[PDB]
Design an enzyme around this catalytic site. Structure first.
Site, PDB file in Angstrom:
ATOM      1  N   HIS A 194       0.800  -1.228   0.000  1.00  0.00           N
ATOM      2  CA  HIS A 194       0.000   0.000   0.000  1.00  0.00           C
ATOM      3  C   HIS A 194       0.832   1.277   0.000  1.00  0.00           C
ATOM      4  O   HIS A 194       0.307   2.366  -0.281  1.00  0.00           O
ATOM      5  CB  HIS A 194      -1.050   0.058   1.126  1.00  0.00           C
ATOM      6  CG  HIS A 194      -0.551  -0.234   2.521  1.00  0.00           C
ATOM      7  ND1 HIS A 194      -0.565  -1.504   3.093  1.00  0.00           N
ATOM      8  CD2 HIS A 194      -0.120   0.592   3.489  1.00  0.00           C
ATOM      9  CE1 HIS A 194      -0.052  -1.434   4.327  1.00  0.00           C
ATOM     10  NE2 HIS A 194       0.217  -0.150   4.571  1.00  0.00           N
ATOM     11  N   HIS A 219       6.314   6.941   5.679  1.00  0.00           N
ATOM     12  CA  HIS A 219       5.856   6.409   4.400  1.00  0.00           C
ATOM     13  C   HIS A 219       5.286   7.574   3.610  1.00  0.00           C
ATOM     14  O   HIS A 219       5.103   8.671   4.169  1.00  0.00           O
ATOM     15  CB  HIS A 219       4.868   5.235   4.580  1.00  0.00           C
ATOM     16  CG  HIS A 219       3.649   5.720   5.284  1.00  0.00           C
ATOM     17  ND1 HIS A 219       3.554   5.762   6.692  1.00  0.00           N
ATOM     18  CD2 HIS A 219       2.501   6.294   4.835  1.00  0.00           C
ATOM     19  CE1 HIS A 219       2.383   6.287   7.037  1.00  0.00           C
ATOM     20  NE2 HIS A 219       1.718   6.679   5.913  1.00  0.00           N
ATOM     21  N   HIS A 274       2.206   8.889   0.475  1.00  0.00           N
ATOM     22  CA  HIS A 274       1.052   8.664  -0.399  1.00  0.00           C
ATOM     23  C   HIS A 274       1.269   9.531  -1.604  1.00  0.00           C
ATOM     24  O   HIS A 274       1.773  10.648  -1.442  1.00  0.00           O
ATOM     25  CB  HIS A 274      -0.234   9.095   0.319  1.00  0.00           C
ATOM     26  CG  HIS A 274      -0.438   8.354   1.599  1.00  0.00           C
ATOM     27  ND1 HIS A 274      -1.193   7.236   1.733  1.00  0.00           N
ATOM     28  CD2 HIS A 274       0.061   8.606   2.822  1.00  0.00           C
ATOM     29  CE1 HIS A 274      -1.161   6.845   3.012  1.00  0.00           C
ATOM     30  NE2 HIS A 274      -0.371   7.645   3.701  1.00  0.00           N
ATOM     31  N   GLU A 331      -3.152  13.328   0.774  1.00  0.00           N
ATOM     32  CA  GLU A 331      -4.369  12.920   1.470  1.00  0.00           C
ATOM     33  C   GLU A 331      -5.053  14.167   2.046  1.00  0.00           C
ATOM     34  O   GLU A 331      -6.201  14.468   1.709  1.00  0.00           O
ATOM     35  CB  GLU A 331      -3.966  11.936   2.572  1.00  0.00           C
ATOM     36  CG  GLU A 331      -3.251  10.730   1.998  1.00  0.00           C
ATOM     37  CD  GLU A 331      -3.526   9.518   2.831  1.00  0.00           C
ATOM     38  OE1 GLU A 331      -3.036   9.405   3.953  1.00  0.00           O
ATOM     39  OE2 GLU A 331      -4.213   8.609   2.314  1.00  0.00           O
ATOM     40  N   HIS A 357       4.261  10.998   5.672  1.00  0.00           N
ATOM     41  CA  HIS A 357       3.767  10.787   7.028  1.00  0.00           C
ATOM     42  C   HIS A 357       4.907  10.243   7.880  1.00  0.00           C
ATOM     43  O   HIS A 357       5.350   9.112   7.641  1.00  0.00           O
ATOM     44  CB  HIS A 357       2.591   9.800   7.004  1.00  0.00           C
ATOM     45  CG  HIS A 357       1.404  10.427   6.382  1.00  0.00           C
ATOM     46  ND1 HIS A 357       0.310   9.656   5.920  1.00  0.00           N
ATOM     47  CD2 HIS A 357       1.092  11.738   6.235  1.00  0.00           C
ATOM     48  CE1 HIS A 357      -0.597  10.522   5.483  1.00  0.00           C
ATOM     49  NE2 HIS A 357      -0.146  11.750   5.628  1.00  0.00           N
ATOM     50  N   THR A 400      -5.236   6.924   8.087  1.00  0.00           N
ATOM     51  CA  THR A 400      -5.876   7.158   6.792  1.00  0.00           C
ATOM     52  C   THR A 400      -5.999   5.894   5.948  1.00  0.00           C
ATOM     53  O   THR A 400      -6.518   5.945   4.831  1.00  0.00           O
ATOM     54  CB  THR A 400      -5.109   8.209   5.959  1.00  0.00           C
ATOM     55  OG1 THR A 400      -3.850   7.639   5.619  1.00  0.00           O
ATOM     56  CG2 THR A 400      -4.950   9.520   6.692  1.00  0.00           C
ATOM     57  N   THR A 401      -5.590   4.751   6.487  1.00  0.00           N
ATOM     58  CA  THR A 401      -5.821   3.480   5.874  1.00  0.00           C
ATOM     59  C   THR A 401      -6.457   2.575   6.903  1.00  0.00           C
ATOM     60  O   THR A 401      -6.321   2.822   8.097  1.00  0.00           O
ATOM     61  CB  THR A 401      -4.578   2.774   5.311  1.00  0.00           C
ATOM     62  OG1 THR A 401      -3.897   2.167   6.397  1.00  0.00           O
ATOM     63  CG2 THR A 401      -3.622   3.682   4.597  1.00  0.00           C
TER      64      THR A 401
HETATM   65  C1  LIG Z   1      -1.780   0.358  13.639  1.00  0.00           C
HETATM   66  C2  LIG Z   1      -0.900   1.542  13.203  1.00  0.00           C
HETATM   67  C3  LIG Z   1       0.030   0.851  12.243  1.00  0.00           C
HETATM   68  S1  LIG Z   1      -1.033   1.087  10.818  1.00  0.00           S
HETATM   69  C4  LIG Z   1      -0.931   2.733  10.148  1.00  0.00           C
HETATM   70  C5  LIG Z   1       0.044   3.657  10.407  1.00  0.00           C
HETATM   71  F1  LIG Z   1       1.079   3.363  11.182  1.00  0.00           F
HETATM   72  C6  LIG Z   1      -0.056   4.938   9.906  1.00  0.00           C
HETATM   73  F2  LIG Z   1       0.964   5.719  10.180  1.00  0.00           F
HETATM   74  C7  LIG Z   1      -1.042   5.315   9.033  1.00  0.00           C
HETATM   75  S2  LIG Z   1      -1.222   7.007   8.368  1.00  0.00           S
HETATM   76  N1  LIG Z   1      -1.348   6.812   6.755  1.00  0.00           N
HETATM   77  O1  LIG Z   1      -2.430   7.479   8.963  1.00  0.00           O
HETATM   78  O2  LIG Z   1      -0.011   7.687   8.681  1.00  0.00           O
HETATM   79  C8  LIG Z   1      -2.023   4.373   8.767  1.00  0.00           C
HETATM   80  F3  LIG Z   1      -3.049   4.691   7.997  1.00  0.00           F
HETATM   81  C9  LIG Z   1      -1.979   3.095   9.346  1.00  0.00           C
HETATM   82  F4  LIG Z   1      -3.006   2.287   9.100  1.00  0.00           F
HETATM   83 ZN   LIG Z   2       0.037   7.686   5.715  1.00  0.00          ZN
END
Ligand SMILES: CCCSc1c(F)c(F)c(S(N)(=O)=O)c(F)c1F
Ligand SMILES: [Zn+2]
Ligand SMILES: CCCSc1c(F)c(F)c(S(N)(=O)=O)c(F)c1F
Ligand SMILES: CC(C)CC(C(=O)O)C(=O)O
EC number: 4.2.1.1
Length: 257
Positions: free
Chosen positions: A61, A91, A93, A103, A116, A195-196
Site C-alpha cells: 500500500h 511512508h 502517499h 491525502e 507521514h 488514513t488506511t
Molecule cells: C496500527 C498503526 C500501524 S497502521 C498505520 C500507520 F502506522 C499509519 F501511520 C497510518 S497514516 N497513513 O495514517 O499515517 C495508517 F493509515 C496506518 F493504518
Molecule cells: Zn500515511
C-alpha cells in the site's frame, strides 16, 4: 484485501472497518480561513539527531522506512502534544500524476504526494498498543510539490528499484529524516485517524504549512513501485491516497498567522 482500486478502495473500507464513517476520520481538507490561530500552541520540537533507520519495505500500500524505536532516539514533542512521541516509521502517499496524491488538502488544493512521519506516545510503551488509544499517535504530515529536487530524499528514491513488489524489503541504515523537512515548522493540527484500514481514531495530526519540493524524476520513481506481489498482474502503486473526509464537529488549529 483492502486497497485503492474501484472494488476495494476507500469507498469500500467501511464494510470491514465501520469506523470509516466515524466522527474523527482523516484526512480532511484544511480550510486555511476557518482554522483557528492558537497563540497558546507551542513550537513543535522535532529531535531527530539520533534517529536510527533500519529497513525499507513495500507493504502493498506504500513503502515504509522503519526506525529503531526501542530507545528515546527521534522524538516529537511540544506543539499540541502532551508528553513525548517516538518516531517509528515514515511512508508516503502519492498520485498517478502531479496534480493529485496528497491525502490532506489545503483550501481543496491537492499536492503531488504527502509524507507521514509516524510517532507513538511513549506513555503506551510501543506503537501497536498506542494505536489503540485516542492520543496514541502523532503523525507529522508534509506535502510534496513537484519542482526542484529534495537532496535528502534521494537515498530513498535510489533504493526503490530493490523493493518493487509487495513484500520486498532491504536494509536501510543511516537515513537522516531531517533531510525531508521544510524550513518552517509552522503547522495545522486536528484530532483524527489512520488514513488506511484499520482507520483507528488514534492520531493527533500535525500538518506542516510549507511543502517540500521534490523533482519530477524523484516522484516518477515512486510511481514505478507495484501494489502487487511478484508473479501477480502488474498494478503500479499510484493513487494510494484516501480522499478528504467530513470534518464533523472538529476544529483545525494553526500555530501561525
Ligand atoms: C496500527 C498503526 C500501524 S497502521 C498505520 C500507520 F502506522 C499509519 F501511520 C497510518 S497514516 N497513513 O495514517 O499515517 C495508517 F493509515 C496506518 F493504518
Ligand atoms: Zn500515511
Ligand atoms: C476483487 C474483490 C475484492 S474482495 C474485498 C473487497 F471488495 C473489499 F471491498 C474489502 S475492504 N472493506 O476491506 O475494502 C476487502 F477486504 C476485500 F477482500
Ligand atoms: C501496517 C501494515 O500492516 O501494513 C501499516 O498499515 O503500515
Amino acid at each position: 484485501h483492502w486497497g485503492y482500486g474501484k472494488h476495494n478502495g476507500p469507498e469500500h473500507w467501511h464494510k470491514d472497518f465501520p469506523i470509516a464513517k466515524g466522527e474523527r476520520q482523516s484526512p480532511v481538507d484544511i480550510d486555511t480561513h476557518t482554522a483557528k490561530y492558537d497563540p497558546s500552541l507551542k513550537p513543535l520540537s522535532v529531535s531527530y539527531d539520533q534517529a536510527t533507520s533500519l529497513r525499507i519495505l513495500n507493504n502493498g500500500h506504500s513503502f515504509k522506512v522503519e526506525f529503531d524505536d526501542s530507545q528515546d532516539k527521534a522524538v516529537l514533542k511540544g506543539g499540541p502534544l502532551d508528553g513525548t512521541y517516538r518516531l517509528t516509521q515514515f511512508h508516503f502517499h502519492w498520485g498517478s500524476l502531479d496534480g493529485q496524491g496528497s491525502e490532506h488538502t489545503v483550501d481543496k488544493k491537492k499536492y503531488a504526494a504527502e509524507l507521514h512521519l509516524v510517532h507513538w506516545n511513549t506513555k503506551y510503551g510501543d506503537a501497536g498498543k498506542a494505536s489503540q488509544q485516542p492520543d496514541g499517535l502523532a503523525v507529522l504530515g508534509i506535502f510534496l510539490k513537484v519542482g526542484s529536487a529534495k537532496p535528502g530524499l534521494q537515498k530513498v528514491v535510489d533504493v526503490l528499484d530493490s523493493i518493487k513488489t509487495k513484500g520486498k524489503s532491504a536494509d536501510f541504515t543511516n537515513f537522516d529524516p531531517r533531510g525531508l523537512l521544510p524550513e518552517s515548522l509552522d503547522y495545522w493540527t486536528y484530532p483524527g485517524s489512520l488514513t488506511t484500514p484499520p482507520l483507528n481514531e488514534c492520531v493527533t495530526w500535525i500538518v506542516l504549512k510549507e511543502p517540500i519540493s521534490v523533482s519530477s524524476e524523484q516522484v516518477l520513481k515512486f510511481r514505478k513501485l507495484n501494489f502487487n506481489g511478484e508473479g501477480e498482474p502488474e498494478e503500479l502503486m499510484v493513487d494510494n491516497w484516501r480522499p478528504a473526509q467530513p470534518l464533523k464537529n472538529r476544529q483545525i488549529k494553526a500555530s501561525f498567522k
